[PDB]
Amino acid sequence: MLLPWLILIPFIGGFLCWQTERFGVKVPRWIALITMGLTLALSLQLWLQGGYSLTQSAGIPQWQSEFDMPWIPRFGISIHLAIDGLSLLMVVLTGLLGVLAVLCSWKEIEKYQGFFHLNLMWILGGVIGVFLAIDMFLFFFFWEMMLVPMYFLIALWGHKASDGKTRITAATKFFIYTQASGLVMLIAILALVFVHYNATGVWTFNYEELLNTPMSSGVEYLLMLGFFIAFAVKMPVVPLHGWLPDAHSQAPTAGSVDLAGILLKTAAYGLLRFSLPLFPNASAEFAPIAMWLGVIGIFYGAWMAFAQTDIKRLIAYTSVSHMGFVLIAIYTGSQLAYQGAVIQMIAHGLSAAGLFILCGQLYERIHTRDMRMMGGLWSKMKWLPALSLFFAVATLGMPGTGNFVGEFMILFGSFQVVPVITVISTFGLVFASVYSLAMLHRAYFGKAKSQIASQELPGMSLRELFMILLLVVLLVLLGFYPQPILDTSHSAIGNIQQWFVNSV
Amino acid sequence: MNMLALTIILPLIGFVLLAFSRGRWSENVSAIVGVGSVGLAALVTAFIGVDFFANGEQTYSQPLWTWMSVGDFNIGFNLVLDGLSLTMLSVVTGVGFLIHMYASWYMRGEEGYSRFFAYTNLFIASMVVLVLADNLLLMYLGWEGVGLCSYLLIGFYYTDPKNGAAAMKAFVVTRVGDVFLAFALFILYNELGTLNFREMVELAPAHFADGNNMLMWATLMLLGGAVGKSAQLPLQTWLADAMAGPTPVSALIHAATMVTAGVYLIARTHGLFLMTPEVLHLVGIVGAVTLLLAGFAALVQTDIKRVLAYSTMSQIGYMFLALGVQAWDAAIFHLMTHAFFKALLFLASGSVILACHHEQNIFKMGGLRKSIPLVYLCFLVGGAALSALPLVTAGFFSKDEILAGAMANGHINLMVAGLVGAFMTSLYTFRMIFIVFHGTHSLPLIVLLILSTFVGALIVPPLQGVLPQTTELAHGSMLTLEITSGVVAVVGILLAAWLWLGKRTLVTSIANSAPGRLLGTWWYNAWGFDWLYDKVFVKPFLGIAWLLKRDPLNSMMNIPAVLSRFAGKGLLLSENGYLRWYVASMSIGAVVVLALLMVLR
Ligand SMILES: CCCCCCCCCCCCCCCCCC(=O)OC[C@H](COP(=O)(O)OCCN)OC(=O)CCCCCCCCCCCCCCCCC
Ligand SMILES: CCCCCCCCCCCCCCCCCC(=O)OC[C@H](COP(=O)(O)OCCN)OC(=O)CCCCCCCCCCCCCCCCC
Ligand SMILES: CCCCCCCCCCCCCCCCCC(=O)OC[C@H](COP(=O)(O)OCCN)OC(=O)CCCCCCCCCCCCCCCCC
Ligand SMILES: CCCCCCCCCCCCCCCCCC(=O)OC[C@H](COP(=O)(O)OCCN)OC(=O)CCCCCCCCCCCCCCCCC
Ligand SMILES: CCCCCCCCCCCCCCCCCC(=O)OC[C@H](COP(=O)(O)OCCN)OC(=O)CCCCCCCCCCCCCCCCC
Numbered sequence A: 001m002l003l004p005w006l007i008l009i010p011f012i013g014g015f016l017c018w019q020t021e022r023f024g025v026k027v028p029r030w031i032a033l034i035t036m037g038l039t040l041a042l043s044l045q046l047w048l049q050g051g052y053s054l055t056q057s058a059g060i061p062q063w064q065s066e067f068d069m070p071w072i073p074r075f076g077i078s079i080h081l082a083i084d085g086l087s088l089l090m091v092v093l094t095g096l097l098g099v100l101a102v103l104c105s106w107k108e109i110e111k112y113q114g115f116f117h118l119n120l121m122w123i124l125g126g127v128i129g130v131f132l133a134i135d136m137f138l139f140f141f142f143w144e145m146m147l148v149p150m151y152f153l154i155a156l157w158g159h160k161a162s163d164g165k166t167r168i169t170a171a172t173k174f175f176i177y178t179q180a181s182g183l184v185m186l187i188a189i190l191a192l193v194f195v196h197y198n199a200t201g202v203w204t205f206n207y208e209e210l211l212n213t214p215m216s217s218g219v220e221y222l223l224m225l226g227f228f229i230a231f232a233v234k235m236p237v238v239p240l241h242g243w244l245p246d247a248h249s250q251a252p253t254a255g256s257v258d259l260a261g262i263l264l265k266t267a268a269y270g271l272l273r274f275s276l277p278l279f280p281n282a283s284a285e286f287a288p289i290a291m292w293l294g295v296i297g298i299f300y301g302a303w304m305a306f307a308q309t310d311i312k313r314l315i316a317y318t319s320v321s322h323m324g325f326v327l328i329a330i331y332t333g334s335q336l337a338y339q340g341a342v343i344q345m346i347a348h349g350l351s352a353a354g355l356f357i358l359c360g361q362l363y364e365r366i367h368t369r370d371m372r373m374m375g376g377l378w379s380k381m382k383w384l385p386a387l388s389l390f391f392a393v394a395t396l397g398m399p400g401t402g403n404f405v406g407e408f409m410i411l412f413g414s415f416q417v418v419p420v421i422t423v424i425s426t427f428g429l430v431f432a433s434v435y436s437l438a439m440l441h442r443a444y445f446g447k448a449k450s451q452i453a454s455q456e457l458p459g460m461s462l463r464e465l466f467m468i469l470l471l472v473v474l475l476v477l478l479g480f481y482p483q484p485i486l487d488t489s490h491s492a493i494g495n496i497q498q499w500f501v502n503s504v
Numbered sequence B: 001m002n003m004l005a006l007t008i009i010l011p012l013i014g015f016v017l018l019a020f021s022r023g024r025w026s027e028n029v030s031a032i033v034g035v036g037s038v039g040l041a042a043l044v045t046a047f048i049g050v051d052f053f054a055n056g057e058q059t060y061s062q063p064l065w066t067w068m069s070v071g072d073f074n075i076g077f078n079l080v081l082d083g084l085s086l087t088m089l090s091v092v093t094g095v096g097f098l099i100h101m102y103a104s105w106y107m108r109g110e111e112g113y114s115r116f117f118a119y120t121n122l123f124i125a126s127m128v129v130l131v132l133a134d135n136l137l138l139m140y141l142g143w144e145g146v147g148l149c150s151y152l153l154i155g156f157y158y159t160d161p162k163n164g165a166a167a168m169k170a171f172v173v174t175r176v177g178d179v180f181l182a183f184a185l186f187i188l189y190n191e192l193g194t195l196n197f198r199e200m201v202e203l204a205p206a207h208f209a210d211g212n213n214m215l216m217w218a219t220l221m222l223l224g225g226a227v228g229k230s231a232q233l234p235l236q237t238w239l240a241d242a243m244a245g246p247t248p249v250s251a252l253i254h255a256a257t258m259v260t261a262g263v264y265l266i267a268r269t270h271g272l273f274l275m276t277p278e279v280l281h282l283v284g285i286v287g288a289v290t291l292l293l294a295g296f297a298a299l300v301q302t303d304i305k306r307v308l309a310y311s312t313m314s315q316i317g318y319m320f321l322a323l324g325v326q327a328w329d330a331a332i333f334h335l336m337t338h339a340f341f342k343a344l345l346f347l348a349s350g351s352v353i354l355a356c357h358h359e360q361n362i363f364k365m366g367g368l369r370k371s372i373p374l375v376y377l378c379f380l381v382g383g384a385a386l387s388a389l390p391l392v393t394a395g396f397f398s399k400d401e402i403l404a405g406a407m408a409n410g411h412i413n414l415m416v417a418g419l420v421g422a423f424m425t426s427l428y429t430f431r432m433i434f435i436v437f438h439g440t441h442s443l444p445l446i447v448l449l450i451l452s453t454f455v456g457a458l459i460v461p462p463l464q465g466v467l468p469q470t471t472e473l474a475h476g477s478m479l480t481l482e483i484t485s486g487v488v489a490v491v492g493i494l495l496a497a498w499l500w501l502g503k504r505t506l507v508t509s510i511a512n513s514a515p516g517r518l519l520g521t522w523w524y525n526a527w528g529f530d531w532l533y534d535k536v537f538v539k540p541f542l543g544i545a546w547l548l549k550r551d552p553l554n555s556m557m558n559i560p561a562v563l564s565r566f567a568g569k570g571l572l573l574s575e576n577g578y579l580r581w582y583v584a585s586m587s588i589g590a591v592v593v594l595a596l597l598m599v600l601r
């Protein structure tokens, strides 16, 4: 009953951010702050009242909360939301990152700031809707819902130092990739619904009824491939990754845009919720190809991140490699690897959010993004290079941060299932250390390679320092005490895994 | 007892306080905070040892919380304390406190005083986590922590890019070792379902009754992690280049914390290694060859730092030889004594560097016995302990125990490798001493001077009950072993005096010869392993990064857009605006539609 409000509070908040711009130009940032605060507080209350640590696995369907309302009764389409542990963790994560995105866009007050905030809130509400929707048409609708505010954020409010045409090019590349993949997913959804209708005779887009739909191996493989292509563009999975560094480089220079739209992983959750249960045999036969695609993604993302002269492109390719790890984890049959994948998703969200925020602050201070135009910035800036050192250490895979817990539980489960791919992925961890040290050496250590680098730069203010330190504390606590997260996601992960391994 | 968590927490508190101070505090306050955290850890270690010996040397366990729990995957955040853990903890805390006091004197007037002490406090905390961990994953936490702190401390002078390059090299080689260690963890958990050491050695003989290949793989990957952290073959190339950092960093890394971690890895997991005898013999062979190559390389170095680095490499090779011949007590005894005298040697070389300037070549300096007498005495005592001078130094008794253990287990080849290594150790050590020193009573220096003598050999680690007893040698055979080791060290000292103390004509004639020049160039570059690793790993990595620097997968996914633009431009040629062509196109389409209907029918 709170899930409709979990989606509607961002949308009403964005409408109010647009509407209360007339009383002041410093007002819409406030209204955005309250609406993401209430969204985060509602998600936290759903965590507190859910009792996710005590609930046991009983098989799909098993939702801690549910909501249904008919939307298009001709096709059997309803606004059908449901929440369990995995969805709850993703919703709490996107609420926290939405609050951090509102905080990151602070002190940036100009005309049509309310429209920026409205686009931000609509992106975040669409992300929450993808995490909550458990009927296929509403899931697809929310899937394509975020991309229009995302497109207008990249194209209109993007990197102000760009030509103006490159921002439009990156936004168009991102939109075309994501929407063509979504359309292929819609073809798969439609064909699955028609197969179910030919089997039974009733229209349903509900995911619970579409489970155990009798179909042949070729048809199931094709439907799984359509779903996988949609989830592979947005994960990203190589070679469908090309939109990501260009969208990150041309995104609004605060980096709040990255946190709100580009950095959350609806694709891994989509694979876990709708690929493995809906098509278990097809996912079982597709597992070698997807695991090798994940291996290639790890090493390709590492080699790309090492070759970048741009910080933002570097961090985007770090995201590519870590999602290669998650893609290997998803197609195993291991509960341990799935729990590691959940921890990895949360920790990569936190760590990449910190990295992108710190890069935005660094660009604000030095007005350039070329690593060859700076050096020895440790001696010039008070707080930023040490926190950037911590976040490079976190994305490196260091114990004490949640990234290590995620990667290593993934690798333990994967080695129980597939040893060779696990070995190659650990050498991927070596490559990750290589690019993290390369970024640290090129940016903050050495001598100044330009005149702007050899100047005393102003320190971080209290708000941005406090949000960075909150991210640091959350990453350290996730590294040392990841048990509440595992207890939250345990029942959902057990349901997904027991469905996937018992039907093959 | 029940204060091991305090021995971890106090360096952590010091690291957090000194990092968040970020240079705002005075040098005195930052100094007392850092050295007080490490000294309080040492004092709590002393109280823990007193309580441990007050009981019947029984193993203590302090489970703080549970780290991870996914089904059967139950990784605990528990500390353990036995004789081996107490030995390594006391060595780490005490020698780290001495090095911290020396650095409190030494780092005065330097940028990043508090940053240095924060990094060294995190180093101490990481190594205490490493030695106190009851399971392999918490030990991996400590392993990665000491790797990260070594990277942060080697490249402490970040303004020079050479120090940063050396730090990145050390981190990358140690991370390759840590990936091998991760493979060991994955195999052990997949086979036995636990990572606790006692549970692993209890469960392994029952599980591996039919097949032993997975236990062999697990111990081989444990050995790979050990040689990654201990700078042995084939992951030893980082140690010589890690000399870019300050001398307290070098003393900490080469004596207290980093290179000693592989020895603790093999000793703590000795139960698994005893069930794979070939892998343990490989440990011994790796230690023997590593000590031989390090002795060859230390003979031709032109810097005090590099001589001491390859000396550390050879002594860790001695420890690995002792582990491979099942002389565990000898290995840990040599660990403690080598920590003492190698810390003494590195702090004395730091005083040499401070007293002189610009980090001169060893041939530029000469006749320094008169300007600095106490530093010369510290170098003499450290060199005598390193060269195993009989009955005066603790290193003599340590190498005596190692070689006697190699004798008693029927390892003749490793014994003679150790004897050759001791001869050359005396040779290169007193070569450096007689080249540098021929031609104000600080407390840590005095304490390590006392501990480098036989007073250090009076301290015996309480390993009875943890590690198995080495088989005892016969009295006559061990007496001839003592005599042979003593005269080998003595003629090494005498050859170093005849060879480099004086006109130095014969060494000049040997070095200027063409085979002499070739061998000197070969041994100066650590037998060409840096060149080979560069050409085999670093060059193709940079080549692939340059070949892929403009995203090829993005281009082969962007070619549909190129085809779309080309086809659209081609189709726009039909819209020429001519009405007669439009009529012609309608008639062509009529012909096509009619022909298609007649063909398909
Ligand atoms: C402007 C120019 C540029 C734009 C346009 C470019 C081209 C766009 C179109 C591309 C796709 C072409 C069509 C692909 C689907 C082909 C379907 C097919 O051949 O189906 C035959 C068969 C049907 O199954 P059936 O035999 O009926 O089952 C019952 C008993 N077995 O099927 C089977 O039995 C199963 C066959 C499975 C494999 C076929 C699909 C291959 C897909 C390749 C791409 C995806 C690769 C994997 C993912 C990569 C990373 C995301
Ligand atoms: C745990 C036991 C050991 C086991 C192994 C653990 C391994 C992993 C541990 C990772 C810890 C972080 C290591 C990498 C980041 C180091 C940051 C750093 O260099 O801090 C020093 C810096 C002060 O340097 P300075 O040059 O004096 O000043 C800056 C410019 N004037 O400091 C600053 O500028 C200010 C501080 C910056 C951030 C410091 C580190 C943050 C992370 C640790 C504390 C987190 C908060 C505490 C609460 C945790 C949750 C309860
Ligand atoms: C690796 C170094 C050694 C470990 C200490 C420092 C680790 C990092 C510190 C910051 C993060 C701490 C995260 C964990 C906090 C404690 C976790 C907890 O509450 O565990 C529950 C447990 C209750 O007992 P039990 O029934 O056994 O429950 C088992 C758990 N499933 O609770 C207990 O039993 C509580 C036991 C006492 C815990 C005291 C921790 C003090 C930490 C002070 C650190 C100061 C510096 C912080 C920054 C460090 C560098 C990042
Ligand atoms: C052969 C048998 C024995 C094998 C033993 C195991 C492998 C040991 C490998 C040791 C060598 C590693 C050397 C690493 C050096 C890193 C420091 C360095 O040189 O940095 C240079 C460069 C810096 O980057 P940049 O920022 O561009 O530079 C600024 C100014 N130059 O940074 C770089 O150029 C980065 C270089 C990255 C190197 C990646 C190495 C990957 C290692 C994979 C090991 C696989 C082992 C198993 C192989 C299969 C066995 C069957
Ligand atoms: C001398 C001093 C110490 C030096 C270091 C130690 C020596 C290291 C020598 C090897 C180099 C490191 C590689 C380690 C590989 C470990 C392999 C392993 O653990 O395999 C276990 C796995 C068990 O499978 P099993 O249960 O037998 O399945 C059959 C059903 N009974 O077994 C199998 O499934 C068999 C095949 C396993 C896979 C082998 C090849 C993996 C790929 C290696 C790539 C390395 C380079 C990566 C480069 C990335 C790109 C640059």
Ligand SMILES: CCCCCCCCCCCCCCCCCC(=O)OC[C@H](COP(=O)(O)OCCN)OC(=O)CCCCCCCCCCCCCCCCC
Pocket: B299, B300, B416, B420, B499, B504, B506, B507, B508, B510, B511, B516, B517, B519, B520
């Ligand atoms: C049962 C066994 C008993 C023991 C048998 C012998 C074991 C090995 C003993 C080696 C040491 C012998 C002592 C005398 C030679 C070494 C000391 C010396 O004279 O060094 C001179 C020179 C380095 O001195 P430097 O500081 O550069 O010169 C001062 C500047 N004017 O030195 C040089 O530049 C190079 C000197 C080379 C001396 C000969 C080395 C012989 C061994 C070569 C091994 C080659 C690799 C292995 C085989 C590969 C295949 C052929």
Ligand SMILES: CCCCCCCCCCCCCCCCCCCC
Pocket: B035, B036, B039, B040, B042, B043, B046, B086, B087, B090, B091, B094, B095, B097, B098, B336, B447, B459, B460, B461, B462
């Ligand atoms: C501020 C309080 C300082 C207390 C220091 C306590 C320790 C004394 C000084 C260091 C001595 C180091 C000696 C190491 C001996 C290791 C013996 C190991 C036995 C198993």
